[PDB]
Amino acid sequence: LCRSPEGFGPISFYGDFTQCFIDGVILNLSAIFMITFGIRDLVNLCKKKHSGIKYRRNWIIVSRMALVLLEIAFVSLASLNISKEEAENFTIVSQYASTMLSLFVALALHWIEYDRSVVANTVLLFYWLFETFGNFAKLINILIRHTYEGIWYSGQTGFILTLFQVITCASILLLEALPKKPLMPHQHIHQTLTRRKPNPYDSANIFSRITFSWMSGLMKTGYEKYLVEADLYKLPRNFSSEELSQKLEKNWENELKQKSNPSLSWAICRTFGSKMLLAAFFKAIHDVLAFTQPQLLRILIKFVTDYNSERQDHPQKLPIVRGFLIAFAMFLVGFTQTSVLHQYFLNVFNTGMYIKSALTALIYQKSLVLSNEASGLSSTGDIVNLMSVDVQKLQDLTQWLNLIWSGPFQIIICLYSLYKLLGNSMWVGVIILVIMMPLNSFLMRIQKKLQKSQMKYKDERTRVISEILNNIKSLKLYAWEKPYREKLEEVRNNKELKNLTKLGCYMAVTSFQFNIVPFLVSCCTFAVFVYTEDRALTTDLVFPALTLFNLLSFPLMIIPMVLNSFIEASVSIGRLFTFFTNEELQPDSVQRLPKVKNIGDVAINIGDDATFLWQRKPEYKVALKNINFQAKKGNLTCIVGKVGSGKTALLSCMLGDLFRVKGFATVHGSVAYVSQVPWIMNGTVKENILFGHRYDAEFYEKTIKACALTIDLAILMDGDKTLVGEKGISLSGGQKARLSLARAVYARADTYLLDDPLAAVDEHVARHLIEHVLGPNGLLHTKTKVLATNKVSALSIADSIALLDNGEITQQGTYDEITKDADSPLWKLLSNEFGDSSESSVRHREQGKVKWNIYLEYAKACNPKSVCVFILFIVISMFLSVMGNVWLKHWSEVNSRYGSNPNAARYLAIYFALGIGSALATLIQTIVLWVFCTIHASKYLHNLMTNSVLRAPMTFFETTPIGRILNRFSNDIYKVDALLGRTFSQFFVNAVKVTFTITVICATTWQFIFIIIPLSVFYIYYQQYYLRTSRELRRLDSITRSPIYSHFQETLGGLATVRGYSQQKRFSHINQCRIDNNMSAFYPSINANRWLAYRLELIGSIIILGAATLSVFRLKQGTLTAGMVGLSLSYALQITQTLNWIVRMTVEVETNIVSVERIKEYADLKSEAPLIVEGHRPPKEWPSQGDIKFNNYSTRYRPELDLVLKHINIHIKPNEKVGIVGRTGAGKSSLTLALFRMIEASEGNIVIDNIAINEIGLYDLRHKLSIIPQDSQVFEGTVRENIDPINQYTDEAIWRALELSHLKEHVLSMSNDGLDAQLTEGGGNLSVGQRQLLCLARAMLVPSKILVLDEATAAVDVETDKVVQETIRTAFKDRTILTIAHRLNTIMDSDRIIVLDNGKVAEFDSPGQLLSDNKSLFYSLCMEAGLV
């Protein structure tokens, strides 16, 4: 529209913008950009802000002002220079005018910003960079025109001035974008405590908020140490859960009010929607910028094949420069694509986190407010699952909410992008891509079914091994290791792995299908383009088509996922909306009033003709009817009735729970409350006493003495610091009641509503306590007390007792008055300071280099000669696909050289037989991974692990808890089973694809080897940082995400008390703090992903520039064809995504190969003695009779503990029915364990009939020694096994044993199955005592010369005891026995009783002598017990 050699050309004949477009739009929009936004910011920063916190005029502003004055002088001087020659030009002179007019405002911002702002302004960065971009484009223009036409577009002075306007504007932009530091001024500090610094997202110039460079200070720390939970950064400005919850609550309340038919979905959209349109806009920009990368590739190939065709042999010879400016546009497009995609991810994940912390914290307030009946409809599981999972859906719908349209938008501008390029014959490709979706659904469904079956089989295996880990003592005692370990091998090696090779086969099939369809689209649409009525198929119609098909593949495999998530979230929103409309406590129930009433002990609260109800559903009338009663201040008033007839109902009414129909209901002062079933929160008992109150020590001792729990305080091993575990695992009913009452009294409330706490406390303690706290002489004498009881003494102590019935008041009067009224229910029955409160946020071991030896152990366990084949076929499956593309390149070049397609069939066939090779190689490599590599390791790790756990010294089982030693058989085997096998594939198939991409690019342009080295260094840098910090920032996400629900269900358990103490605020703030403590660790967790992805995608787009400018140099050297720049650059476009998987899967390896370390930790545990040596007498015990002969015997439980036995030398006689007894804490209980070598013999030995047992081995010894463990153990299974693993005895033998054990009938009792009746622990089992008879049957079935009888320390049925004694004295008549009976009665009738004390054999054989020898120690305990 203005005079110039070329008009308003966006792109000149060369590759640049024309001089009438550079300063006509690019350098004119920036100026109006300021005159619209920067002036607004100038107003805003100088309209309400006025301070001097920002430090003095440092040299940074001293330089920015100078480099703006020079810049404005240069703009004016360039206008002056152009005013002389080439003067009359509207666009240029107008651009100069608007330019200095806007640069003055830029100077103004530079002045105001440095005081009234700490964040570098956004406008004065984006404008002030657009200035540099426009001036740089103009300089490039006046260089291109000079080099290609001799003339200068400006006159060799405008050149110098524009070069300066570039060289200063860029320098001053870098000066503005890299400020020194904030708050340098003499101010000392804002937060003196400085517990957690404010996160750097605030105080981060827009460049840092775009390049995510504000985390590069956390990462470094996270790389050089583990990240303790107090090493993170607090939430940004507007992430506090209070703000979000209150915003959403206000909006949703307006929703319930105005919109007649409300909906929570609109309440969420109307609130957190303005941050979603921005994400949608960024997604649209990224989608547009993603489908102009192929267009630029197509343009570059067309340019190359035109330039070469021209140089073979003058109307405007093609300029080489255009090549570079299509090799640079491909970099700008990629860079802006990453910088806009990651802004979309940030602005969508933030809206995700604005619902996981504004609905998580808004469910809790409802739960405190909702009425009782709706609480009881679904008690605890569903309500906590309503935000453990039913909100994680709403926090994941956001990630796939823009793909409702951005899926049907990457498709339209891809189908159209292909139709303009590849003609009408693209449809036969998209039809394949569609009709493969049902196959993907089919395969994923079958894979899910196989995963379910495999998980069920794993549960079966883990229960079978849980039984062993539970009764390992019995297992080692009976020598049942092998014949009941092969019972686990028969599950793993036969039923479980057979459901893993099939899973491997189907994973191989789906991997093959995921590697052929990407190639079966391009080949099958070329096969139609060539043959149908068409034209040449040249290089610029194939290599763009490959990229377009690849970009089309993704938006089609996310259509099922998005709709699945959408339907799931619709269900979840239905659940939430039916939650948020229940009846909520109807707060007009009780009119609470302060306790300023009086000092003369007036009636606190009144019920006049009151008719309360649980809720307006049935029982809504007779819940509580016609109430008229007082409660007196400072007088213990009590109500008594039968169960639920008005006892708990009235108290629950006085708390405001129940609703009233008519009549006044008041309550004076703060109220304490003890629920009928007292509840204990999860924390230290001191916290329970305090219960969120200011700590007054002296009163704490006064209470702990008062409630008679100081004795229990001594009982607890930790005392006031004792952690009261989940639902009071460390407490029982009586201490629970006393603890609840202690909490109540320490609350020091002005009205005590005691709902029958006495029912679980000791009666002596009860009458001890009635006067300490309740009675007139108690500390709570001067406070009013309503009480529910059934005990009698309190009624006499009470003052104004009320007798009720069926939720109705019978009478109200004093004990003497009513007793004088001949009332059968009663007459015939026989000023302080309440505590304060305070609240706030609740809330080294340096890293080490990766463990490489574990990978080598996994390889050696993974058949190393067969893991080379896996990598070999990975290499082959990639090399064949690369050669398929090379053949595509050659065939396309042959098509382009000719007019038409010369030999369609031959080229097309040899191309097809080069993709099928790749897919087939992928199939075979995945099969070798599963069938040969993984399953041959999962069958060698677990085999070795279980073979070395079942042979660990019993001390090992004693020390470590069962909870973890079983975890390694549950998860650390499953993760090795079917979670680490594929994790090496996706990392090895992507550590080769990148290698071959680099190799094919370096083969086209060898100089590229100098770009990939400095890029690989930064790559490993960023990868190591992201690994070592994302592992932490994910662990810290997992740790702090459980206590949110572990606290919600805790609140749901005791809800009438938290509401009862009227401190609903404190628990709500506890929830808000527990939510912010999760967001504070989840924010860095995902912004770490953004940081890494930005770094890699930037690295992924320096290669595109590097492989397209080092390519055009080759072209200018005249050795480049169109194919050589189509192939290499079509791979270069793909390296971005495969540069993330190779990192993501490197994270997934690290969090999985820790499992193999845990396995190998156990697989080499120090074992016990060798099983079998030459000590092999035939009857499994050397003679048919056995007399154990000790000598010098002494040993210890553990190497550090004291000696259990001290130099014992005792000669037991054959078939001598001795009985070993001793008072507790003697070491007698571990004389069996030292007979079966379960604890090794330190000194001496145990010669059993002329042969010892030290040099014999366990398995041969432990055959013929029968024990009856103190805790009788039965395995999950059938009687046929629980009595014999060998089945070497006739079923008649088992039946005669059960008859002589008097338990043949009780097998058929529960189940008529015969012998294979079901047994387990939990469910199908015998009685709590019959297991003793069962173990007796086990002992008697083996014909045993020695039975080391042990008795349960707990109670037992004496009839079972005499049954056992009779059968062992009738079947073991001539047979040795060592009865270790704690109760002296069981062994006082034995043959030669012998007493042990502190590992010393004390007395001699004859028992009567021990009764009649200086009142011996045995006789001393005999008198003490009461048997003599």
From Swiss-Prot:
The main location is: membrane
EC number(s) stated in the UniProt entry for this protein? 7.2.2.2, 7.6.2.3
Q: What class of enzyme is it?
A: translocase
Any GO BP: transmembrane transport
Q: Which reaction does it catalyse?
A: Cd(2+)(in) + ATP + H2O = Cd(2+)(out) + ADP + phosphate + H(+); an S-substituted glutathione(in) + ATP + H2O = an S-substituted glutathione(out) + ADP + phosphate + H(+)
The answer to keyword Repeat applying to this record is yes
User: Which residues does this entry mark as bearing Phosphoserine?
Assistant: 240, 841
**Sequence ranges assigned to domain ABC transmembrane type-1 in this UniProt record:** 276-568, 867-1151
Residue intervals annotated with topology Cytoplasmic: 43-62, 110-119, 180-267, 345-400, 446-508, 572-859, 940-982, 1026-1096, 1143-1428
Q: Which residues form the ABC transporter domain?
A: 604-830, 1188-1423
What keywords tag this UniProt record? ATP-binding, Cadmium resistance, Membrane, Nucleotide-binding, Phosphoprotein, Repeat, Translocase, Transmembrane, Transmembrane helix, Transport, Vacuole
The residues on the Vacuolar side of the membrane are: 1-21, 84-88, 141-158, 289-323, 422-424, 530-550, 881-917, 1004, 1118-1121
From the Swiss-Prot or TrEMBL record, state where the protein is found: Vacuole membrane
Q: Which residues bind ATP 1?
A: 641-648
Q: Which InterPro entries match?
A: AAA+_ATPase (IPR003593), ABC1_TM_dom (IPR011527), ABC1_TM_sf (IPR036640), ABC_transporter-like_ATP-bd (IPR003439), ABC_transporter-like_CS (IPR017871), ABC_transporter_C-like (IPR050173), P-loop_NTPase (IPR027417), TMD0_ABC (IPR056227)
Q: Which domain of life is it from?
A: Eukaryota
Any one GO molecular function term: ABC-type cadmium transporter activity
| Amino-acid positions noted as binding ATP 2 in the UniProt annotation, renumbered to this chain | 1222-1229
- Annotated membrane-spanning segments are 22-42, 63-83, 89-109, 120-140, 159-179, 268-288, 324-344, 401-421, 425-445, 509-529, 551-571, 860-880, 918-939, 983-1003, 1005-1025, 1097-1117, 1122-1142
PROSITE patterns, A to Z: ABC_TM1F, ABC_TRANSPORTER_1, ABC_TRANSPORTER_2
Q: Which CDD domains match?
A: ABC_6TM_MRP1_2_3_6_D1_like, ABC_6TM_MRP1_2_3_6_D2_like, ABCC_MRP_domain1, ABCC_MRP_domain2
One GO CC term, this protein: membrane
The family assignment reads: Belongs to the ABC transporter superfamily. ABCC family. Conjugate transporter (TC 3.A.1.208) subfamily.
Name the job this protein performs: Cooperates for the ATP-dependent vacuolar transport of bilirubin and glutathione conjugates.
Print the miscellaneous field.
Answer: Present with 396 molecules/cell in log phase SD medium.
Protein known as:
Metal resistance protein YCF1
Source organism of this protein record? Saccharomyces cerevisiae (strain ATCC 204508 / S288c)
Q: Which gene encodes it?
A: YCF1
